[PDB]
Amino acid sequence: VDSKLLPKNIEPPLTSQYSTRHDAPRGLFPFESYKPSVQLPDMAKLKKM
């Protein structure tokens, strides 16, 4: 007998691949200042001198 023709349970289908967000409390994450500089520093003046 081919599979998926075998008798299966009548249940609510799977919710495994669902995306959840989280309620995090007030003091969990720190306050962040100083945006980091992604850009590399340039040393044209040092090698020019």
Partner: protein, 49 residues
């Protein structure tokens, strides 16, 4: 060396996330007794009651 340059392109953004994630990991170390060690909480002397 094209992918060395790819590794030499996105390195300080990686250090920026390595700083903010470490900052939040330091935020996890908040206990309020490591900080001010005198947190006077509550006392009461001997009453007539």
């Amino acid at each position: 060396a094209l992918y060395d340059y790819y590794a030499l392109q996105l390195l300080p953004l990686q250090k920026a996330v390595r700083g903010h994630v470490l900052q939040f990991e330091w935020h996890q170390n908040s206990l309020l007794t490591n900080t001010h060690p005198n947190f006077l909480s509550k006392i009461r002397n001997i009453n007539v009651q």
